[PDB]
Design brief:
The structure is a homotetramer of 267-residue chains. Chain A is an alpha/beta fold. Chain A is built from eight helices and seven strands; from the N terminus they run βαβαβαβαβαβαααβ. The complex binds nicotinamide-adenine-dinucleotide (4 copies) and 2-(2-cyanophenoxy)-5-hexylphenol (4 copies). Chains A, B, C, D: Belongs to the short-chain dehydrogenases/reductases (SDR) family. FabI subfamily.
């Protein structure tokens, strides 16, 4: 097993399409012992997490909630047992109010909405690192999920800004994590048919932004030298497990692109 | 005159060291007619703006204030006269609470503070574009001030994240501005001895972060193939005027580095 | 005049569509005194250079030719007069054998051909800097022409590799040039209908690479927030003159994108 | 074993410090069956390759030699047996004449020398891909070794240009490789004490370039959030094996930084 003997916390499962679900599945297949965290609808998440290869504790974590964050290391320790620490942490979380995305004009998003999006999508990467680094082993790994925001694009709007902020946060988390002998990296994935995406795609069913999204998806597979299948989160899940393993031990503050190589090609 | 006949709004003057003061000075020398905006201490700003080569209207603008933003185009029109529009807009504004910078630990900044910093330093670039694009001429230019956040560094901390967000915002502002035939770009300047910097440098007088800042300054001039003088904002002011002119007409969504070429050299 | 009183050498004129022709035209309109250099068909070039706003000396320069390079500073000095030096130098030169481009398979280009292309397109930027820096004034400017090679693309093939090398050469030329108080930068232009392009486009009239090139052109104007007109070299010529002026005095080793902002947008 | 059952060709072994030696060692520990290639001093290389965990065929390959390249797939097939194909290929090869590096002035390198360096260090990545892709399995992986050339630096000089070219070549190799279901990536390593480096460091023992190299090494470990040990090629070897494995299946045309995260930090 790639992750045999490792204890890994995975946030972000909401459906069986969640990138986090597939990260969790592949990690368990590779021998990892998981602790899962979920937001809002815990009973629902439990039903999904029951479909994984193996049992795992499920803890509540709303990254907006300072009490949840303050108690997290303690609750995790209770789950994995005193004297044990985490080897990995996966941040697979994001949010942006509907005003900040889709067909909504970029200029019409109130800062209150943008700020909430940045809180959950970017700042919380630092929040989770702050909470969990004190219970991580040397050689450990923190991984977050990114969508390449180096260029602007239709529809993604303020989430692009939140991802740009996340990339910057990741470089600073790496400075802190290094003191614990821990790496911090992001995986920039290509588009995957998840609940999050269905909210975006669904919000523009018939408008120009919806058409633009479909064009972006077609262009992605065309540009990717090895192609890109939006229906398959496995290549992304494997990439996250690679960073969680001991096989990328000199990479930190960085971004690994699991996108079919699309970002390396203009056309 | 490089900017002969152009009407240009300049935000961000607070002292005679302000990058905005030097942008304003050089622009007037090149024939521009200015409208200035100021925050908080208007009487003080007036005293400084009296030391410019020419007279210019001074309007109050707190970019946190939705009423100030909603009335800005109207107030500007009153200043420059009905039937007239702006050819340029300079955003030279930034803020980050003390908890988000200096020697303060990266993990100890409350999101309330980070959010305020991002509001003023990044979101407000979009706010100003939204307010002013309806009164800009085709061929016009919006310019904001940046500090290269591509890599993490000591002390700059959450302001780095705010600049990463600003770069992303600028790429989206360019999409909107293009509909008006208007360009949007940032100037990434090297370090300049201003009031803002004095707040940072001063906040660490004797701590490791203070030493790190001095090291960064020495490294900057060393790396710059043409050198770098932190005591001189003129090269930066000229670069902004270049983007405000008609001489970079095919550049938008972009970043021009006025940093002595330091970002192009490793050592 | 933007370049009033400046003495500027411009290489690369071959037809009235040459980017160099338009750089030369705009520079003269802005008061520059030019020295032109030409390759191979000097009588032909003379006929074109006669259509510029003002007269200018024309010197032969084959950048492959070590004797031409060794005598260049001397020949230029003879042209502009003893005691006078250059304020600017424009490298607007490129070449790649047909085996290295178009529909030709990437793997089928012999190194002898690739090497010749890199010699003329990249190494010669250093050659010209070496020859001319000893006769340049402090505050001077060297500018070369680039086509963004950060990502691979159809048809451009080995020329992309040559441009990647040129970008690297430019960063090293900046180190040397800085000793003379001289800047070195590239302008990355979007596609322009020139003789060079006609050789590429023409070499694939009816093949997949030809179709791919047309798609790239359509995508360019779509992505550019201010649009892109391939029939108009003026915005590019103005950008080069901006770098030749005193208005970008803190930029060196760098690349300015005159591409309608296309490189800042994914779609 | 990470690479259990995979057949992998590894070029570039010359001493027990060679990055390729450590790639080969770690790959064998992970169950790979290797084919090694060597240049010039085959008896010497044999003596070193005898110190690996397991036996492996050693074939002669001078990447300058068109006959060696034309016969390589045939010779490899003879080594691994008819009906068998390669799963991996490692390019760990570089060369630059002494005129192109060290204390030698950048402008004094003859193109004949630069061209030879680019041939071996960059073009040959395409040469090896061309020769070996016809005998690679789908899901296969080609990996080359890089040193981040995004910025100029002392001493590395024309090798920096060769690496910039290599990065561009890699993006085009990925386009070709994708047709075979094969990935192509580079690993950008931090500095490692090898024979190659000893040639550079040794060539400046007492000159400014030698001092600059020592400063670069100290700065590297300082900037790396997890530190950097130039005496240890293992983290780099593991990173290459990660790309050779099935665990980064959606990454191609790309660069993975095994540098302690140094390239993500300014200071
Ligand atoms: N689906 C894609 O195409 C794609 C591509 C690149 C990157 N990503 C990123 O991958 C990650 C997961 O996205 P996904 O596509 O699997 O979507 P998803 O809908 O399956 O999962 C997103 C998760 O965010 C969690 N979340 C939202 N608010 C939270 C809060 N206040 N506290 C704690 N958790 C909260 C949700 O509960 C949910 O489980 C995100 O960072 C996303 O931006 C997705
Ligand atoms: N000084 C440097 O080294 C340096 C380097 C690169 C970029 N910058 C950027 O240049 C710009 C100007 O900085 P400066 O160095 O001239 O500092 P400065 O102190 O001289 O000016 C900063 C301005 O921000 C304005 N501001 C703060 N909050 C505001 C609000 N709520 N509404 C409207 N205005 C507000 C201030 O009133 C002030 O005039 C900033 O974006 C800064 O980050 C500075
Ligand atoms: N046309 C575009 O779309 C475009 C876009 C971006 C960058 N560029 C670059 O702009 C520059 C000029 O290209 P252009 O489009 O105006 O093409 P052009 O055909 O009008 O000019 C190219 C020049 O290269 C010169 N040249 C070729 N070999 C030479 C040698 N051995 N010695 C001296 N000069 C030599 C030619 O004589 C010619 O004048 C090149 O570097 C090119 O790659 C062109
Ligand atoms: N050592 C470092 O610090 C470092 C850092 C980043 C990247 N790299 C890269 O790693 C790779 C290997 O370098 P290394 O440090 O292990 O040095 P090395 O001296 O141990 O190996 C370099 C190899 O190049 C081979 N080579 C040279 N000319 C050849 C030719 N004509 N045909 C076939 N092979 C030839 C040599 O025989 C040798 O085995 C290179 O691409 C190098 O640039 C090294
Ligand atoms: C123009 C867009 C086309 C391709 C989109 C790929 C993509 C899909 C879903 C993503 O997830 C979120 C998106 C927005 C808000 C919250 C989340 C979360 N969690 C993501 O980040 C990127
Ligand atoms: C590690 C740092 C060393 C060099 C710093 C250069 C620099 C100085 C001042 C700057 O201005 C601000 C900084 C923080 C918060 C608000 C503003 C404002 N306005 C800036 O953005 C960058
Ligand atoms: C896929 C391509 C589509 C757009 C191309 C834009 C473009 C056109 C012409 C160019 O000039 C050359 C090209 C090749 C060889 C020599 C020269 C020269 N001189 C260039 O560099 C870039
Ligand atoms: C300023 C430099 C300090 C750090 C250097 C790291 C480094 C060391 C050795 C390298 O290998 C070569 C270098 C030159 C020519 C051939 C090869 C080969 N093979 C390399 O690419 C990079």
């Amino acid at each position: 097993g790639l992750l045999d003997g490792k204890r890994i916390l995975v946030s972000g499962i909401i459906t069986d399409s969640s990138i986090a679900f597939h990260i969790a599945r592949v990690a368990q297949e590779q021998g990892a012992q998981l602790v899962l965290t979920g937001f809002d609808r815990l009973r629902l998440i439990q039903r999904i997490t029951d479909r994984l290869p193996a049992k795992a504790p499920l803890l509540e974590l709303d990254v907006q909630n300072e009490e949840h964050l303050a108690s997290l290391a303690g609750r995790v320790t209770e789950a994995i047992g005193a004297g044990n620490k985490l080897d990995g942490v996966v941040h697979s979380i994001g949010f942006m109010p509907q005003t900040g995305m889709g067909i909504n004009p970029f200029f019409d998003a109130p800062y209150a909405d943008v700020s909430k999006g940045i809180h959950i999508s970017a700042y919380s990467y630092a929040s989770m690192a702050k909470a969990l680094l004190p219970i991580m082993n040397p050689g450990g790994s923190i991984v977050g999920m990114d969508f390449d925001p180096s260029r602007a694009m239709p529809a993604y709007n303020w989430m692009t800004v939140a991802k740009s902020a996340l990339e910057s946060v990741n470089r600073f988390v790496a400075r802190e994590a290094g003191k614990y002998g821990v790496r911090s990296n992001l995986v920039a994935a290509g588009p995957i048919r998840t609940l999050a995406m269905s909210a975006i795609v669904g919000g523009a069913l018939g408008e120009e932004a919806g058409a633009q999204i479909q064009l972006l998806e077609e262009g992605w597979d065309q540009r990717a030298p090895i192609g890109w299948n939006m229906k398959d989160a496995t290549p992304v899940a494997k990439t996250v497990c690679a960073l969680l393993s001991d096989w990328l031990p000199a990479t930190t503050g960085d971004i690994i692109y699991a996108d079919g190589g699309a970002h390396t090609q203009l056309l």
